[PDB]
Point group: C3
Chain length 396, copies 3
């Protein structure tokens, strides 16, 4: 029972208090063994739905809209995603210079060491979008390859709804219907899973705050302000701005996106949030044609929030090492950060690799409050996707 | 052609004779290379059907019955399963004290050594019931996670058969129908696979008897009598008793369950028997709502037969080591044996670990006649499931 | 736009020229990093369709035809496959004695060494046809186990279309329809993928020719002529012959099979070609009952082209080692090469790796330092030899289907 958009807010506020307090008294362990499992059951239940929903929804949606309309949606959302992600870095740099995170600090070296995994060739990453076995792609995670096949099937069904034959048209009928059955059924499930969300949300930040809340002091606090005040501006100064521009109401969009935003914040999984991010798209009544393609692709490609975190970390490390960056170095961040634990790749691009003993001991502090910084980031990550879909949907 | 509940019995009796004799003359190898493959083809053909049947049947069954009725079935069958499994251990201990398996024996030490795999945390095992990717769960074995998703889908379909919409209700219609198609088709297959059963049943015990039949002498025979006479009592003294109590006829239940019992006995796979265990449930006309949930869950959770084997082995090892067990130690078995090659976990609970050189050399003999003991166990394992379903079904 | 059976031929002829030339100037690297990815995208897009098509098509096809008719098709196509594969070896031996590949050569020893993976027991390979988890079989490759379950399901649907019940018959209706939906949809996709074929075909042989074209000189050329002239005879002297015999027109069959043949040639994947091999079967209007069973089984079992390659290599190695083979040794090849083309895989080159099993049968194992250094040269021009082989491999399947289809 009870209005559930409040139960979540109650759980979230009450969770932060029960969190920060328990952990400060040394119950960092206690929370992990007792409370966290309830927060995990929530995450599990959401991940459960991702594969059926993304696939099933997209076959229907791609079979619903024109193969021309879809491409135009595609090119629009990508142009949108890159520009928002670029804007988010330059806004993070502005925060990292507005604040001075780790400016005066001279930290303890040689404690921790790192070796980043070197990223796979671009050619191989693009070819891998085309899956060599659909049932394989579905079986093990793999959002992007699934997206591809779902559209290739979506378009295939539509061309069968036209055949000069009756029995051909009658089979493509039932298949596209059955797939929709699943898509309908899956959305229905999230409505029930969101019922357990209060308990999950409470439990989930109860853990984040107990484990890493206490570590948010000193220079490791100034970075947190830098990230959050920056993330706030990505919402007000970039989304609210582009929503007004495109004839949408910012306030009633935030009203409708409330669930996807808090799941994304609590869960830290842009991907694990997808069923909720997607339901909220259907809630505000965006075309299944558009949102079933833009949101799963954006769950992977559009990370405005994270792109900001990468900007404000590249400045934390630079300040702690004790050498500032110029116009030619700062712009080298923005490009690499768009093109990109993968912060390890935008750190070599400026000239301070992660293997470097003192760089590595500085990054060790940052990774120490990561789950705190990553809540805010994942929310703005996900919000950025809904904003893009809403804009592309307005222009069809 | 020919009445097939006889061809199986012929194959089973003729198999034991051709088995015990061939192996006693040294053809333990010959049977393995020539006969066994035919027995394997049977097991393969049954495992083949497990995944489609369990999933497809359960979506239909859970979409058929009330979400309230199902939970009441759930709580009833679990309460039944634990109590039957508890009863089976205390009956195995009674047999292990009635007989004296390995009492006087002092066996050869240092021959064989063991190291048991330490079981995964409980928290992680319960969370793992909720699958993170259904298509994944289906792809690789995994009965329990599938069970969960099948019901979550089953309940979802039913809530779509109610929607104020026509096209929504029409898609959930076709999906639930198609899934039923599979479920219907799969049951039909087992009817043909049971046609090959005679050849398989013959071949299968021909191997068990040739390989391990000769080893059933001495103290390793007294344990076999202790297990089988004990298992006999679990059927007559526990199942026949609870069937009469609940207004079912014991004799015509054994008549209907005949196929699932002999498959389970010959095949040693409680899970591999499932398509037959399930068909026999539909044969006696139990609701697809009930049996499609109770039987696959019971295929994993309810092992009365094995729980007895664990009781009478914990006493074989104790007698061979030469120290008896008290009331506080015997009750420590019953609890751990309910809560549990996993015999290695109920052996540490009494205080005689499996790593211990002389414990390990004693367990080596027991594992030497395992396939003999395991035939009877798996039968009672599977029987116990049908009995539970029949009882819960009577009380709806 | 544009007639696409030409765009492929243009790409194929223009590819060989842009290939052989770029590689001879040292751009073997340049082609691999720039051109090949385009040829890969084609291969990827075809493999993509294999699993849905083979399964979906076969459930429909097996639910369409009589369980008696299917068995008779089964026994006919297998009898055909073995006899064609046997004929292909004895034709390869004839070419390996007609030509003398590596007769006078005495090659550099101790350069390269090999150790072949020992093949799994027959019992275990036959039992493995029956899959223990269908969804598992579908998930990871596995053509043969899928074939089995698709038929077992196909037959099951048909027995449900008969039930005294209405709601039972109505569900088996929708399921068999939905599966057909996929099967229909999947064939429709290959029609679009074949649109990208020109670019792929061009890119694909551009690579084969740049990488291995230059190595086709000397004794390594005489073997290539021996293979290709042999493969040509398998088509004219064996397929054209058996097609006429069975009241089919050879020329208009080659016309209809054109796409599957060039995909198979360019792609080197008998399995990867399957969606095209299958579409071409529906194009010439063979019963979905027959081709949906014969072609995927034949994609793995019937490798006439490869069986010839195994015959003409067993003679290249024998001549290079410097000891000829007798009647009792040559017939020991034909039997083992059939029994190893029955088990050879349907993927780029990995058939020319089971040649290691038909080399021990004559008495010259692959571990032997000078045998291994001779096989090293052969594997050096494998992608050239394997193009032709895979084409004749795939063609042989269509020929068999057409023959069995004529006799229903
Ligand atoms: Na995102
Ligand atoms: Na059981
Ligand atoms: Na082939
Ligand atoms: Na083969």
């Amino acid at each position: 029972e009870y209005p559930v958009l409040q139960k979540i807010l109650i759980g979230l506020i009450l969770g932060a208090i029960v969190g920060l307090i328990l952990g400060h008294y040394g119950y960092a362990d206690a929370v992990k063994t007792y409370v966290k499992p309830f927060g995990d059951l929530f995450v599990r239940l959401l991940k459960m739905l991702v594969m059926p929903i993304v696939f099933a929804s997209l076959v229907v949606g791609a079979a619903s809209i024109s193969p021309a309309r879809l491409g135009r949606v595609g090119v629009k959302i990508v142009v949108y995603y890159l520009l928002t992600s670029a804007f988010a870095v330059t806004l993070g740099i502005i925060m990292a210079r507005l604040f001075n995170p780790g400016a005066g600090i001279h930290l303890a070296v040689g404690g921790q060491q790192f070796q980043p995994k070197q990223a796979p060739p671009l050619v191989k990453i693009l070819l891998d979008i085309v899956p060599t076995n659909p049932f394989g792609a579905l079986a093990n995670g793999q959002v992007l390859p699934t997206i591809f096949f779902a559209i290739i099937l979506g378009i295939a069904i539509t061309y069968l709804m036209n055949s000069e034959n009756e029995k051909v048209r009658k089979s493509a009928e039932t298949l596209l219907d059955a797939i929709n059955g699943l898509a309908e059924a899956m959305y229905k499930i999230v409505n029930g899973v969101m019922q357990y969300a209060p308990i999950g949300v409470f439990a989930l930040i109860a853990y984040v705050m107990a484990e890493q809340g206490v570590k948010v002091v000193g220079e490791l606090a100034k970075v947190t302000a830098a990230v959050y005040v920056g993330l706030t501006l990505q919402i007000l100064l970039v989304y609210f701005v582009l929503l007004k521009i495109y004839g949408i109401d910012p306030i009633s969009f935030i009203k409708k996106a409330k669930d996807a935003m808090l799941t994304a914040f609590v869960t830290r999984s842009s991907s694990g949030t997808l069923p909720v991010t997607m339901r909220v798209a259907k809630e505000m009544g965006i075309s299944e044609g558009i949102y079933s393609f833009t949101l799963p692709l954006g769950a992977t490609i559009n990370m405005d929030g994270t792109a900001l975190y990468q900007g404000v970390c590249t400045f934390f490390i630079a300040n702690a090492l004790g050498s500032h960056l110029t116009v030619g170095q700062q712009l080298t961040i923005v490009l690499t950060a768009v093109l990109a634990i993968m912060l390890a790749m935008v750190l070599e691009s400026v000239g301070l690799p992660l293997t470097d003993p003192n760089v590595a001991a500085a990054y060790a502090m940052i990774l120490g409050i990561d789950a705190i910084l990553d809540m805010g980031c994942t929310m703005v990550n996900v919000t950025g996707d809904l904003t893009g879909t809403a804009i592309v949907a307005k222009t069809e």
